[PDB]
């Protein structure tokens, strides 16, 4: 009855599902996790927001056309204003997050094409002058 | 002086400090060859009390 192509994702009160999945990556092959005390820097006690904050937000939706070259963000800056892990991102000096990314896009059996969808560390890019 | 510390005003997470203060010893901070003076001497064929 399990499939790879069928997942529930629940962060908070925020639930995903999917029918037509690939599998998922974890990136690296390591989990999110909070920081360890023995490789703890900052010395007070920090906000954990949890729930308030680890949940899906959805971005305003882009037009796949066939002539899209392709679209880019960074991140925590897409997420900057997004409910309270916006405020609690702005309010404080310092902050760690790592992120469920769930990319969304469907069509018919009888449309075609293909997107890569990268998590690229440090993506640093070029200017233009 | 004041004794004070963190833990003592605000609410701390646990952070172990693996640092230490080795560069700081007085051996480590005297630990170098430094210049105290430039001298001067010269070899010619001297004819006067000067030179
Ligand atoms: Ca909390
Ligand atoms: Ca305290």
Redesign the interface.
Same mark, same amino acid.
């Given at each position: 009855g399990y499939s790879d192509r069928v997942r529930q994702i629940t962060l908070g009160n925020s639930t995903i599902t999917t029918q037509e999945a690939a599998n998922a990556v974890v990136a690296y092959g390591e989990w999110p996790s909070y920081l360890d005390?023995?490789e703890?820097?900052?010395?007070?006690?920090?906000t954990e927001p949890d729930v308030s904050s680890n949940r899906f937000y959805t971005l305003d939706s882009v037009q796949w056309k066939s002539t899209s070259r392709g679209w880019w963000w960074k991140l925590p800056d897409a997420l900057k204003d997004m409910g309270m892990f916006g405020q609690n991102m702005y309010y404080h000096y310092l902050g760690r997050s790592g992120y469920t990314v769930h990319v969304q896009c469907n069509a018919s059996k009888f449309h075609q094409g293909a997107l890569g969808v990268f998590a690229i560390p440090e993506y640093v890019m070029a200017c233009n002058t | 002086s004041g004794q004070a510390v963190?833990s003592d005003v605000?609410?701390?997470?646990? !952070? !172990?400090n693996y640092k230490t203060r080795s560069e700081s010893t007085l051996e480590s901070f005297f630990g170098r060859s430094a210049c105290v003076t430039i001298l001067e001497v010269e070899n010619f064929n001297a004819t006067t009390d000067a030179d």
């Open positions: 005390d023995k703890a820097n900052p010395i007070d006690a920090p | 963190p605000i609410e701390t997470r646990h !952070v !172990v």
